[PDB]
Scaffold this active site. Structure first.
Site, short mmCIF file in Angstrom:
data_model
loop_
_atom_site.label_atom_id
_atom_site.label_comp_id
_atom_site.label_asym_id
_atom_site.label_seq_id
_atom_site.Cartn_x
_atom_site.Cartn_y
_atom_site.Cartn_z
N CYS A 262 0.80 -1.23 0.00
CA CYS A 262 0.00 0.00 0.00
C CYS A 262 0.83 1.28 0.00
CB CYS A 262 -0.92 0.02 1.22
SG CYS A 262 -1.92 1.53 1.35
N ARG B 213 -0.03 4.59 2.95
CA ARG B 213 0.10 4.39 4.39
C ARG B 213 0.44 5.61 5.26
NH1 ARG B 213 4.24 -0.31 4.84
NH2 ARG B 213 4.65 -0.02 2.59
N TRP C 171 -9.40 6.03 -0.35
CA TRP C 171 -9.85 6.60 -1.61
C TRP C 171 -8.94 6.04 -2.70
CZ3 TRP C 171 -8.39 9.93 2.43
CH2 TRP C 171 -7.04 10.32 2.41
N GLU D 153 -5.35 3.19 -10.45
CA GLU D 153 -6.05 1.93 -10.21
C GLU D 153 -7.21 1.80 -11.18
OE1 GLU D 153 -6.54 0.73 -5.94
OE2 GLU D 153 -6.19 2.90 -5.74
#
Ligand code: HEM
Ligand code: HEM
Ligand SMILES: Cc1cc(N)nc(COC[C@H](CN)OCc2cc(C)cc(N)n2)c1
Ligand SMILES: Cc1cc(N)nc(COC[C@H](CN)OCc2cc(C)cc(N)n2)c1
Ligand SMILES: C[C@H](O)[C@H](O)[C@H]1CNc2nc(N)[nH]c(=O)c2N1
Ligand SMILES: C[C@H](O)[C@H](O)[C@H]1CNc2nc(N)[nH]c(=O)c2N1
Ligand SMILES: [Cl-]
Ligand SMILES: [Cl-]
Lengths: 362, 362
Positions: B65, B68, B237, B242
């Site tokens: 991720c 973070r 969000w 993506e």
């Protein structure tokens, strides 16, 4: 230990090489010859067939290279006979000329005498045979920052650059028994350069960008059957992203994205506008267009990945394990548009191969 | 073995958690309480403070991720009290509403009762709480191919999709003691969607693309101090890539690049034109523009990488090891334009964390 390493590597290489060449019946006698030669001399000498196939195998095993489909057509030039710095120089000039081939680039390697007691016979200082100088002093940066340390070393040896952004570094190398390397200016008739223009945007020429035609890596060690060829420059042709997404784009290289944005008429103010991404694409289109227009070999990352897929298929068909470094194989633009991004690769080291070695400057 | 694993994980978690919360003096007594509870009941129950900080730590430890930096502001909703399918449904509806927050997305996790004997209390089938259906039959592909198997499973349970390219899947989950999951249609008033338009190219709306506002992963297991929360949906969000570089671009997803090329007026015929790359950039600009215009939170990959740099700096300052998965952290467009591409990351697994688990369909 030294000799045992050599012998063990020799056995593995000769067996594999001769199997690939359909010479399996000859392995037994060749190994005997080799073991006696190691016992008597401390080393052994490759046949021309072994050296050639060894260099090809080394390319095939290069985990970080997307271009490996063509491993078996590598042009191998055996220069284990050189003894003088004039012979080395002329061999390097010749590699440039024959690899360049008037723009229709031939993947080529020139192999110099190998290390003896770990003692180098020829020590090449250049990172690539053709590369631009770099300077940094009192805030002022000129040329390719990646070349700053080698450039400073050359200028310690009596060379002086013109301090344009594209000075060609001289060839620089040291002979066994010499304390200092010698340097030689590259004849400009040998060096093809490509000015960067864009297919649709006339202003792109205002950036006055160019790059050299042929990337010739000259600071890696070829290892074949336990023999260390520390001096063995090799080249392919460029994949366009190497020039457009890295050499000309990296902040620690030529850092041209803001200038690219301006000439293509977009603002470089907001991350959400993706101006860096758009500039990268146009700069990369320009690089490919420019090489093609001039008749200098180049490959785009989509075509290269398609070729690499064929290399994977060919390995499986031949019953060979495939190895690769995912982090280097993915191209630095649109990587998820290639099949490479969506699979994994075993990053194990298989020999013969090409290896990094310590720089003699720095 | 089971109990020893639990106890060992419990000791490590409680010590670390209480140190971070300045509660180090309370560790000794809490562990005693916990060990007696394990001995007597086979398990233990987190305090609300432990559960909240545990979920935050799990986010902080999520190697894949890039988002973070904001781990410590995760909104944790404790629903360990639910017992009925109506309560689960309403809890999931509520997560959608409160996380969406009229477009100003709040990173949120809702935590359901944990596994007992490895026996799940609540088993969520959805991959994300909001996702589009997918269909494939007799050559005909509709919607999101990634959802084909879950869609078919839903239609085995009496649900029927309209077979548009953007059917919302119902919530689907199973309760302990029930043989079949139940499903519930999502109220459309709860679900924010964003139509994709381009800032400068009017024709882009001809593609009739849209995507949902909030990605809410609902099929991963939160592990905290040896306790397995298999049902604990969480959301942040979107980072624009993506949607623009993967969901709408992948050949095995919505596969829109050829259509994008056409509406932006470029040929999609030659790899060397980099039309896929150019289409990706414009599609990605459109996604960011569209979310911003509608007032739905989103981040671009440059800003996200800059935030992640701050997360790295913050970890070092706090004296915590940083872990990460380079292959997931690099964005799928212009990765070398981010600092992430140019460094490496330790991909070790640290707990608490979020983990994959086997799907109950397939
Ligand atoms: C024929 C055209 C070729 C293409 C298009 C090609 C493509 C590439 C590319 C894109 C890289 C990544 C380099 C970087 O990002 O710095 C690379 C690395 C590499 N290639 Fe190839 N290559 C070709 C030929 C060759 C040949 C002929 C050899 C050796 C005989 C070779 C050996 C390697 C090695 C060793 C690396 C890794 C260099 C390093 O670690 O720094 N390649 N190749
Ligand atoms: C606040 C905004 C956030 C952003 C912008 C963000 C960004 C991302 C991105 C881009 C990915 C890559 C996903 C993919 O390619 O499929 C990802 C993965 C992940 N994120 Fe975040 N994230 C955010 C919030 C969160 C939160 C709140 C959690 C958990 C509490 C979380 C946990 C994860 C996990 C576990 C993965 C890996 C998923 C997998 O392995 O499939 N993220 N994140
Ligand atoms: C033989 C060859 C062909 C081809 N197309 N590209 C290459 C790679 O060119 C050299 C390559 C730079 N792109 O070197 C990688 C590298 C870069 C840097 C900065 C350091 C280093 N040790 N190694 C080699
Ligand atoms: C919490 C969160 C925020 C954010 N911006 N993005 C994410 C990741 O979204 C879900 C992510 C798809 N982009 O899931 C990764 C994944 C994808 C696929 C195809 C399979 C799988 N097991 N896991 C999570
Ligand atoms: C095989 C490879 O690891 C796979 O394509 C990964 C690469 N990196 C990724 N990174 C992100 N963020 N999301 C993904 O789905 C993937 N896929
Ligand atoms: C740290 C990281 O491995 C580094 O940026 C690598 C990533 N992948 C790469 N890939 C290629 N082809 N060339 C490079 O120089 C790099 N750099
Ligand atoms: Cl280069
Ligand atoms: Cl998603």
């Amino acid at each position: 230990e030294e000799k045992e390493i050599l012998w063990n590597e020799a056995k593995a290489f000769i067996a594999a090489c001769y199997q690939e060449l359909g010479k399996a019946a000859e392995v037994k006698d060749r190994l005997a010859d080799i073991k006696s030669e190691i016992d008597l001399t401390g080393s052994y000498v490759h046949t021309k067939e072994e050296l050639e196939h060894g260099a090809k195998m080394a390319w095939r095993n290069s985990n970080r290279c997307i271009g490996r489909l063509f491993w078996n057509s590598l042009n191998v030039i055996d220069r284990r006979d050189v003894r003088t710095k004039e012979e080395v120089r002329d061999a390097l000039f010749h590699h440039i000329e024959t690899a360049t081939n008037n723009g229709k680039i031939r993947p080529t390697i020139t192999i110099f005498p190998p290390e003896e007691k770990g003692e180098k016979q020829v020590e090449i200082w250049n990172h690539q045979l053709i590369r631009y100088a770099g300077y940094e002093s009192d805030g002022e940066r000129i040329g390719d920052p990646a070349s700053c340390s080698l450039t400073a070393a050359c200028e310690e040896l009596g060379w002086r650059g013109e301090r344009t952004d594209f000075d060609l570094l001289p060839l620089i190398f040291r002979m066994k028994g010499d304390e200092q390397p010698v340097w030689y200016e590259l004849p400009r008739s040998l060096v093809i350069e490509v000015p960067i223009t864009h297919p649709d945007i006339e202003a792109f020429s205002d950036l006055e960008l160019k790059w050299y035609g042929v990337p010739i890596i000259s600071d890696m060690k070829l290892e074949v059957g336990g023999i260390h060829y520390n001096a063995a420059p090799f080249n392919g042709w460029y994949m366009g992203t190497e020039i457009g997404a890295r050499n000309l784009a990296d902040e620690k290289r030529y850092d041209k994205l803001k200038k690219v944005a301006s000439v293509i008429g977009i603002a470089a103010d907001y991350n959400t506008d993706l101006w860096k991404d758009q500039a990268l694409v146009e700069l990369n289109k320009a690089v490919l267009h420019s090489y093609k227009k001039q008749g200098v070999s180049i490959v785009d990352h989509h075509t290269a990945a398609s070729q690499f897929k064929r290399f994977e298929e060919q390995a499986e068909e031949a019953g060979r394990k495939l190895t690769g470094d995912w982090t280097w194989l993915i191209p630095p633009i649109s990587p998820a548009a290639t099949h490479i991004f969506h699979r994994s690769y075993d990053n194990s080291i298989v020999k013969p191969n090409y290896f990094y070695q310590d720089k003699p400057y720095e």
